[PDB]
């Protein structure tokens, strides 16, 4: 079990040939190079208003040396509101399973369509919050980070998927009070966490914020997807075991909820 | 009385894409009834749009055969291409049934009706359908353009003599549901035609991973136009401008809905 707050076993390739759609401006997706195993977990990523794919590699880059298919998303109006970032998502598992399907991708007979998750910052994790509303079942996991909403209202109450609502303490874009009401507007019946990071900024989830905290980002991100999309239970110690005690010995957060 | 075309028809649906190889496109895919017990079956093609694929569309290939439909669904040669390549790929699948039919090894030998072809397609492949339509003229009976995008092609619309419903969705951001709304205007006055723009609708619901409560309203509308204006079965009249279709208004199911018999 790879500790999840640095790099996994696996060496990271990346390609962006054949990735265009009319739903996003520019996506590229980060795998394990060897691609050894029958199929893989795979998960969209992208950031918020101004931000671009290549700001997000901190956390592709990561997830895909646990062993991750990442496809990290540029969208259409990277100034547009948190319905583009909704498209965006959406443009992301479509085409995650038609790369599974063209014979010509790196990707071909290589994904799980069952162990799909979408990730994404600011108004990407508000974009992530909406497409897991209206994807339903059709994917597994959502990972909305310092999500923003706007004027925006998922439809909550069709969201199955198991849901990680992270937060930051000094976060004066994404309130973390604005993101912990969305955590509680979640289905009772999900699994779900809500995990407002101490000293953390809304910018410490792009390229440019603090290596350290991100690694307590990275931990809970990563321990999440191993739980809840591969069902790997050596990382539940990082969720309610003996290393979330570690993480509360260090006060890692403001706040913490989970419902396993 | 007929069965309900939001969910499967009542045929097991059987595939086969051996013989299927054309030129004019990268790969195709075959669904069909079973038993094909009638003497002959209505066909469509259907296809995907920009960076889609065949595998995509199969929430409503296989729903179709389900209800009776012979579908051919195809992958063109240039998923990445313009408009014009999906109408290459809907001649081309007109061209392949034609050959089929004609195939003595085929499963559809002898079971087509070359009176009831049609040609349904979403995206960069519903701006296909409008522009192969207009230059097969008579030879395809409906068309089905679903959230289409033309962007600058320009269809010569006074040579579209199918029946033509034209699907658009309230949210949709890349086929705008006022863009599609002014192909629907364009259409020749004296076919029998359809505009249904549905609330809530975003582009990607025409393809697998589209909302599936909103896709059972998307074929709906689908399968009633088929089977009117294609097998001509006045039966399902009554989800186009009967009870049900009131039931829909009930229900607010469209922010657009216009209907020419």
Same mark, same amino acid.
């Given at each position: 079990? %790879?500790?999840?707050?640095?790099?996994?076993? $696996?060496? =990271?390739?990346?390609?962006?040939?054949?990735?265009?759609? +009319?739903?996003?401006?520019?996506?590229?997706?980060?795998? !394990?190079?060897?691609?050894?195993?029958?199929?893989?977990?795979?998960?969209?990523?992208?950031?918020?208003?101004?931000?671009?794919?290549? /700001?997000?590699?901190?956390? &592709?880059?990561?997830?895909?040396?646990?062993?991750?298919?990442?496809?990290?998303?540029?969208?259409?109006?990277?100034?547009?509101? !948190?319905?583009?970032? $909704? &498209?965006?998502?959406?443009?992301?598992?479509?085409?995650?399973?038609? $790369?599974?399907?063209?014979?010509?991708?790196?990707?071909? *007979?290589?994904?799980? %369509? &069952?162990?799909?998750?979408?990730?994404?910052?600011?108004?990407?994790?508000?974009?992530?919050?909406?497409?897991?509303?209206?994807?339903?079942?059709?994917?597994?996991?959502? =990972? !909305?980070?310092? !999500?923003?909403?706007?004027?925006?209202?998922?439809?909550?109450?069709?969201?199955?998927?198991?849901?990680?609502? /992270?937060?930051?303490?000094?976060?004066?874009?994404?309130? %973390?009070?604005? =993101?912990?009401?969305?955590? /509680?507007? +979640? %289905?009772?019946?999900?699994?779900?966490? +809500?995990?407002?990071?101490?000293?953390?900024?809304?910018?410490?989830?792009?390229?440019?914020? *603090?290596? *350290?905290?991100?690694?307590?980002?990275?931990?809970? =991100?990563?321990?999440?997807?191993?739980?809840?999309?591969?069902?790997?239970?050596?990382?539940?110690?990082?969720?309610?075991?003996? $290393?979330?005690?570690?993480?509360?010995?260090?006060?890692?957060?403001?706040?913490?909820?989970?419902?396993?």
């Amino acid at each position: 079990a %790879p500790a999840p707050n640095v790099p996994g076993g $696996e060496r =990271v390739c990346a390609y962006t040939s054949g990735l265009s759609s +009319l739903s996003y401006a520019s996506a590229r997706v980060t795998y !394990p190079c060897t691609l050894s195993k029958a199929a893989y977990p795979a998960t969209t990523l992208t950031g918020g208003f101004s931000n671009t794919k290549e /700001q997000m590699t901190w956390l &592709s880059e990561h997830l895909s040396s646990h062993g991750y298919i990442v496809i990290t998303i540029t969208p259409r109006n990277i100034f547009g509101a !948190p319905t583009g970032w $909704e &498209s965006a998502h959406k443009a992301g598992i479509a085409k995650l399973r038609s $790369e599974r399907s063209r014979r010509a991708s790196p990707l071909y *007979n290589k994904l799980d %369509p &069952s162990k799909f998750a979408l990730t994404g910052f600011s108004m990407g994790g508000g974009g992530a919050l909406l497409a897991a509303a209206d994807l339903g079942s059709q994917v597994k996991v959502a =990972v !909305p980070m310092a !999500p923003f909403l706007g004027s925006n209202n998922p439809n909550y109450s069709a969201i199955t998927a198991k849901v990680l609502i /992270q937060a930051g303490a000094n976060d004066t874009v994404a309130n %973390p009070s604005t =993101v912990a009401s969305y955590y /509680q507007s +979640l %289905p009772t019946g999900i699994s779900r966490a +809500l995990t407002t990071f101490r000293s953390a900024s809304h910018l410490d989830w792009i390229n440019t914020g *603090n290596t *350290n905290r991100q690694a307590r980002l990275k931990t809970l =991100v990563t321990s999440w997807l191993k739980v809840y999309l591969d069902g790997n239970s050596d990382y539940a110690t990082y969720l309610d075991g003996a $290393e979330h005690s570690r993480h509360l010995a260090e006060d890692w957060f403001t706040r913490f909820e989970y419902v396993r």
